[PDB]
Design a protein around this nucleic acid. Structure first.
Ligand code: MG
Ligand code: MG
Ligand code: ZN
Ligand code: ZN
Ligand code: ZN
Ligand code: ZN
Lengths: 162, 162
DNA sequence: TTGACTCTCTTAAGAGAGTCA
DNA sequence: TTGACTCTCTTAAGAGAGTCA
């Protein structure tokens, strides 16, 4: 098995490579009518992506390193968390984009949490709008707001009570 | 079926049948430390479910009627909305449980909205905790809260900024 | 050892359609 | 005509693994 030192070396090589990705400045809602700035380190749209990186899906990538003749591969956003527990409350941990920018690989924009916690950030009011996430959101979720509901609750007769 | 009269007759038959489902009282968090009460009309756990109803999945049902000598079938929660647009901004409209109780078929607990709007209600703070849904939530979402994040954003080196 | 592709899978909110009796 | 089953699919947040040179 890879040793702690070998895992640290994987994380360090990943950081070195991602740190050279184009850094894109994005202005983002924080909640409470305030605007902030996030700096995303974006993997390229097409090959080559960077040493060790390859695309396995439209917005999915993997990082690969060969150590002592054995090929090891990880989801491209999971690398910062290789020294962390991989499950919690019986749920698999997932890499969760605090910046909501799938191509971004900035580890300061990622956290490691259940898929439900991950998804829920899409609707968070944001760090200046009432976020209650213990690991705080960096921005208001892109789907926060009144929504676009086409039809609300309704009955034609009198068979029901709320 | 095709005619407005036929569609109204389908909605009316559905309401009459669902109106005879057992009414189960559920006390629910509203947000803001307040509690409310919902009356869910719950489809049975096993056959028979009611005239026109059959289970297509562990928590999935369909309603069917024979009109013009042909079988017409719908997802069991979609029937209240047969006269509504079936899409919004190019996204499919879905039946969305305001009570977060799949077996419930009370139309006073359903709305018709995109899957994203639907999902997002799982994390809403609720009608007394800051819900901003234009079609208001009936309760705080079951997944609202601080989450259980295992690891937050972090870097080993000095290549990244927020 | 490395790059650039290929494929299918998970989850939990939701769907459509076919086989028998 | 009605009932009770069977199967696979959609979405958008996420995954693992194979092939070839
Ligand atoms: Mg996410
Ligand atoms: Mg729902
Ligand atoms: Zn980012
Ligand atoms: Zn948050
Ligand atoms: Zn209900
Ligand atoms: Zn709400």
């Amino acid at each position: 098995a890879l040793t702690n030192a070998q895992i640290l070396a994987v994380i360090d090589s990943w950081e070195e490579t991602v740190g050279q990705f184009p850094v894109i400045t994005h202005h983002v809602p924080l909640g409470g009518g305030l605007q902030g700035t996030l700096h995303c380190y974006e993997i390229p749209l097409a090959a080559p992506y960077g040493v060790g990186f390859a695309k396995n899906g439209p917005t999915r990538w993997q990082y690969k390193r060969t150590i002592n003749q054995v090929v090891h591969r990880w989801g491209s956003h999971t690398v910062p968390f290789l020294l962390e527990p991989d499950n919690i409350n019986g749920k698999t941990c997932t890499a969760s984009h605090l910046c909501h920018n799938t191509r971004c690989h900035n580890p300061l924009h990622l956290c490691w949490e259940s898929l439900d916690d991950n998804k829920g950030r899409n609707w968070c009011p944001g760090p200046n709008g009432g976020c209650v996430h213990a690991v705080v959101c960096l921005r208001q979720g892109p789907l926060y707001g009144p929504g676009a509901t086409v039809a609300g609750p309704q009955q034609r007769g009198s068979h029901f009570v709320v």
